[PDB]
Write a protein that binds this ligand. Structure first.
Ligand SMILES: OC[C@H]1O[C@H](O)[C@H](O)[C@@H](O)[C@@H]1O
Ligand SMILES: OC[C@H]1O[C@H](O)[C@H](O)[C@@H](O)[C@@H]1O
Ligand SMILES: OC[C@H]1O[C@](O)(CO)[C@@H](O)[C@@H]1O
Ligand SMILES: OC[C@H]1O[C@](O)(CO)[C@@H](O)[C@@H]1O
Length: 684
């Protein structure tokens, strides 16, 4: 930012001294002094001081940061002619583009490769499909085939994306933030193969960077996946290692992300043509790059002529080959959500918290919709200027993603109260329905639901019938329904309406009617209003499957428990048992069962009998990243308890820690005992 000289920022781990030698030759020929600095955290200092017109004339950094600098207008558009652009590998120019315009010069290229132990594995595998058999071979020799960091998506992405996956679609020099390839058939096939490697004991789901590096550099595993930064540590080991092309999957190359060390020009620089001359004519030449490479190695470089020299090192050649088959890392701000969404998906799928399809689906959603704490924070700040309809829209969308940001939902409630004067019923109802879906109770709880009752009392009968059900049901979820609202939906007219339907929509409306009716029966003791007539109350997951098989083994006989028990309240129990006072199973269906629509037995349960319900909770039954159930299932559990059941909760994350059948039986028996003991303590 000073005329007549050039100031260059570059990270401290690069060959800034070799870069200075280029500056000295530049001064010698042009008379322009060139100064090179390596300030700490320059990738964060640069947007600070360039926003106000200060900083260096040229900055060196990985290309992904430059996309954000350009958005702020901090990087000048560069003007290399086609003659110069032909000197560099074409794909590298695709990394220094913003809104179709070049904003930096490619310098060096970096990507993951396959690193292998030539003593354990003289010829590395060409394909991913061979590795399992190879691991069986090596496990018998006291070794393993492959170990790499499974915790961070940067290392797993080469396999996930091999057969068609991609972060954001790139076309005509631009990224399409709406076109996300996290959940297509290629991403699924790759992740499935990764998960299968784990299930088959060829890889461990806990393996991270440190574990894999130690294993390979100690000679314990025949292969790893890593980058040039890791070569020094292997040189200091005793492993005769090679570096080569990543294996194919479905005959498609592995697609690692590519990092392009680039040089940008400060938009606030008065020496843009001097910076252009130094970069194009002195740095990006065989002599210039050699000078920098002599100080600290660049790895593979974008300049074709010098890459031919460096590529004599077969490790550099493999780096460039993998980069040319890889996916340039998108330089757009939308990648932040990608990293978080995909990281969660891989961990969830590899550990069994989700299937491959479920995990990638959510990562897709998370990447397309850019959900992040910054999103909720941005909305929280707009709240005073948002309309009632915009809040209703917000609430609906967050509830749909099961994303319960307590600070934002409390601001929804306050927003509604501050506009109780003119807020329309639809806008109020959208918030109510969102609160119920996520089981959110605001701090000004009495005030919020007083408004709901007030606004809804006079207009409820005139609403569409299915909507009346949706709204009363939401109040039942939140324990706010009033007898007059229950009555409005439970009087003998409303039923015949939805009762006789095949739509699956009337059937859902009716199911919610059973929940309302169940609330009146079980949670309002003084309720003397109308109820549904007794005559009108009459796909399998792995968790559901294993829970049933484990329970069948414990019970021993079919008569000591009932599986998939449909109640007259709409809810279905995974299982029910009747324990006598000694904790031994009784023949449950020999006894009366008020919770059921049909009577199934005449005998009265012995005194001291304890009726237990096993209730399974699946991953989607919870708010995102929490152990709090959605409203629908808070309501279900509240009803089963009110029906006189002791609860054995079987959430997926508890069952997931039980790796053997013995553990699963022991866990269920413990939960039964604990529930019964919890009760006896209640009665004191
Ligand atoms: O080279 C930058 C980074 O590359 C990747 C590695 O996980 C990290 O250890 C290294 O520092
Ligand atoms: O954290 C509260 C509860 O979370 C869930 C678990 O089923 C339960 O065991 C635990 O007490
Ligand atoms: O290539 C640069 C990238 O490499 C990583 O270390 C991989 O974990 C990232 O943290 C960084 O952004
Ligand atoms: O979200 C709260 C709910 O979470 C559970 O622990 C899940 O098993 C229930 O016991 C509890 O009521």
């Amino acid at each position: 930012t000073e005329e007549g000289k050039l100031v260059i920022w570059i990270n401290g781990d690069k060959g800034y001294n070799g870069l200075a030698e280029v500056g000295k030759k530049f001064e010698k020929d042009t008379g322009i002094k060139v100064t090179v600095e390596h300030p700490d955290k320059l990738e964060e200092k640069f947007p600070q001081v360039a926003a106000t017109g200060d900083g260096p004339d040229i900055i060196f950094w990985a290309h992904d940061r430059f996309g954000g600098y350009a958005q702020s207008g901090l990087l000048a558009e560069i003007t290399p002619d086609k003659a110069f652009q032909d000197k560099l590998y074409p794909f590298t120019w695709d990394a220094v583009r913003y809104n179709g315009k070049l904003i930096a010069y490619p310098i060096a290229v970096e990507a993951l490769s396959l690193i292998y132990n030539k003593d354990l594995l003289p010829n590395p595998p060409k394909t991913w499909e061979e590795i399992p058999a190879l691991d069986k071979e090596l496990k018998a020799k006291g070794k393993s085939a492959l170990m790499f960091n499974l915790q961070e998506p940067y290392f797993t992405w080469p396999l996930i994306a091999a057969d068609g996956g991609y972060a954001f679609k790139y076309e005509n020099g631009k990224y399409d933030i709406k076109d996300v390839g996290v959940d297509n058939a290629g991403a699924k096939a790759g992740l499935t193969f990764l998960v299968d490697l784990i299930k088959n004991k060829h890889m461990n789901a806990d393996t991270d960077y440190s574990i894999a590096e130690a294993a390979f550099n100690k000679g314990e595993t025949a292969m790893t996946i890593n980058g040039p930064w890791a070569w020094s540590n292997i040189d200091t080991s005793k492993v005769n290692y090679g570096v080569t092309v990543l294996p194919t999957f479905k005959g498609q190359p592995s697609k690692p992300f590519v990092g392009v060390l680039s040089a940008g020009i400060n938009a606030a620089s008065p020496n843009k043509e001097l910076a252009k001359e130094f970069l194009e004519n002195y740095l990006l030449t065989d002599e210039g790059l050699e000078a920098v490479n002599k100080d600290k190695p660049l790895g593979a470089v974008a300049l074709k002529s010098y890459e031919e020299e460096l590529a004599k090192d077969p490790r550099i050649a493999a780096t460039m080959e993998n980069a040319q088959k890889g996916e340039i890392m998108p330089n757009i701000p939308q990648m932040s959500a990608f990293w978080y969404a995909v990281r969660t998906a891989v961990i969830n799928a590899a550990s069994g918290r989700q299937t491959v399809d479920e995990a990638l689906k959510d990562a897709q959603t998370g990447t397309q919709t850019q959900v992040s704490q910054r999103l909720a924070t941005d909305l929280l700040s707009l709240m005073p200027s948002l309309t009632s309809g915009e809040v209703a829209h917000c609430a609906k969308s967050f509830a749909l993603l099961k994303w319960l940001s307590l600070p934002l939902f409390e601001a929804f409630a306050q927003h509604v109260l501050n506009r109780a004067q003119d807020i329309t019923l639809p806008h109020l109802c959208s918030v109510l329905l969102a609160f119920a879906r996520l089981n959110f109770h605001p701090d000004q709880e009495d005030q919020f639901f007083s408004l709901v009752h007030e606004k809804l009392g006079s207009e409820l009968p005139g609403l569409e019938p299915a909507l009346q059900v949706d709204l009363v049901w939401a109040l039942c979820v939140l324990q706010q329904a009033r007898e007059a609202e229950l009555q409005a939906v439970l009087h003998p007219e409303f039923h015949i309406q939805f009762l006789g339907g095949k739509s699956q929509k009337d059937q859902n409306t009716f199911q919610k009617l059973l929940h309302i009716n169940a609330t009146a029966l079980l949670e309002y003791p003084e309720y003397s209003g109308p109820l549904l007539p007794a005559s009108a109350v009459a796909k399998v997951t792995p968790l559901q499957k294993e829970l049933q098989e484990t329970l069948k083994g414990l019970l021993g006989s079919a008569d000591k428990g009932s599986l998939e028990v449909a109640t007259q309240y709409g809810w279905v129990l995974d299982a029910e048992v009747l324990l006598d006072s000694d904790g031994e199973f009784l023949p449950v269906r020999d006894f009366v069962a008020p919770h059921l629509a049909q009577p199934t037995g005449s005998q009265s349960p012995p005194p001291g009998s304890k009726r237990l319900a096993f209730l399974r909770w699946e991953f989607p039954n919870f708010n995102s990243r929490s152990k709090d159930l959605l409203g629908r299932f808070v309501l279900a559990r509240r009803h089963i308890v009110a029906a006189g059941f002791l609860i054995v909760d079987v959430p997926f994350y508890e069952w997931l820690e039980l790796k053997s059948e013995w553990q699963k039986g022991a866990y269920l028996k413990d939960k039964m005992r604990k529930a019964v003991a919890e009760e006896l303590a209640k009665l004191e």
